Design a protein around this ligand. Sequence first.
Ligand SMILES: Nc1nc2c(ncn2[C@@H]2O[C@H](COP(=O)(O)OP(=O)(O)O)[C@@H](O)[C@H]2O)c(=O)[nH]1
Length: 318
Amino acid sequence: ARLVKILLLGAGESGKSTFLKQMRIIHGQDFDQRAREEFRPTIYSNVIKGMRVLVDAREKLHIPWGDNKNQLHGDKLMAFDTRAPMAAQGMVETRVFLQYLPAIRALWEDSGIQNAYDRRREFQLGESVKYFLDNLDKLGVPDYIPSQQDILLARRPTKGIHEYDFEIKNVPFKMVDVGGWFECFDSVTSILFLVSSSEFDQVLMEDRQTNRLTESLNIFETIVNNRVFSNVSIILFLNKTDLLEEKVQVVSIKDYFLEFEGDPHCLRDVQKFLVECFRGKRRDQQPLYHHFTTAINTENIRLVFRDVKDTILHDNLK
Ligand SMILES: Nc1nc2c(ncn2[C@@H]2O[C@H](COP(=O)(O)OP(=O)(O)O)[C@@H](O)[C@H]2O)c(=O)[nH]1
């Protein structure tokens, strides 16, 4: 009754897992040393895969090496057994990571690899890679304990369902992340719908016909127009705002969405257009609650959730 049930919905990589971690950070029990420890294998895997993508890129993009001696380290990492039990699970043990760390460190120092990194628009590199590559100092310490920020940036896909249960001032929340469905649809108070707002110029890896924003808009359409959710507060999170702010400076959304009007290099104009894209998916209304978020930024999410909490209670009361 007093229980607020919130679903997190949105395509994969939209920031749902990261939002759940922020709830634990902000309103729950912060990860203790053993909890943080469990992330270490994922972080190491994120780094190994990222550098593997970068060595593969500069090769396939024909960028010349910075120092030609790094070929050896490129080969070293291209020979990493992805197939193996642990690695196939998106996990790399400490001892294994430390075997590669010298190659990784030398490769990130390379101007050719730095060049490859700059042309990342041209291939698929995980959001966390540069953050961890610049943090090779601390990951490489024999008893590295991941920090809060490291855990937020650690990328592991969600295959099933995650839940975190927390209270704010004796108000209990049940928050459920359904990966990117109909079984958790029961007794829902609010839906937070996460969008990677910076992916307007990307297609689905498994379906190059489909624009990633288009894929998000179509998912949203099926939710927002379902009668089952008529009394449910639906709140749009245009996430990855830090990335959208960078991308608008260099890419024009008009090239992708012919309906855009305004200045495509103006973040505010682009955000206005995205909001209108989602609003326009609804068949029978005229407020779509929305926030421009950066799910990895704890201070942002603190403010946003404060606002969302008020929205839900104002609505969920009335
Ligand atoms: N730069 C940036 N990275 C983000 C943001 N939100 C999430 N990420 C990262 O993007 C990746 C995908 O996020 P994740 O929560 O796992 O998406 P999920 O598949 O919906 O659960 C992770 O590495 C997150 O750290 C954001 O707002 N900005």
